[PDB]
Amino acid sequence: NHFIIGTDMGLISHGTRQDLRVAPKLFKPQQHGIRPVKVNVIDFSPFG
């Protein structure tokens, strides 16, 4: 039910399906400005 979505603007958002207010935060490195790095591959570590 949880998922993340990346955009060309250099940010990745978090969300889910059932409860849409659990943690509506975004992911960002320790950077400033924008840095539209145009994220193109997302994966998940297959572990606990």
Partner 1 sequence: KLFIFTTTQNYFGLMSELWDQPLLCNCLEINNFLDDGNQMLLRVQRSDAGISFSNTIEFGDTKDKVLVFFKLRPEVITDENLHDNILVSSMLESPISSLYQAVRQVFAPMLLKDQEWSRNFDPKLQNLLSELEAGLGIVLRRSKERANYFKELFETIAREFYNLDSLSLLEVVDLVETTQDVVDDVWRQTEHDHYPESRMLHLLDIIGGSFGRFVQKKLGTLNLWEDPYYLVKESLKAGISICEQWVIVCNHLTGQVWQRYVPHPWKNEKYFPETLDKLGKRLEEVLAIRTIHEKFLYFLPASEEKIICLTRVFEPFTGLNPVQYNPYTEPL
Determine if 20 is a binding residue for partner 1 (CB under 8 A).
Answer: yes
17 vs 7: CA distance, rounded Å: 19
Give the nearest distance from C-beta 41 to partner 1 in angstroms: 27
28 Cβ neighbours under 8 A, 6+ residues apart:
11
Among 4, 7, 17, 32, binds partner 1 (CB under 8 A): 17
Q: Yes or no: say if 6 and 37 are a contact pair by the CB < 8 Å rule.
A: no
Determine if 24 is a binding residue for partner 1 (CB under 8 A).
Answer: yes
Applying CB under 8 A, the residues found at the interface with partner 1 are 17-21, 23-25
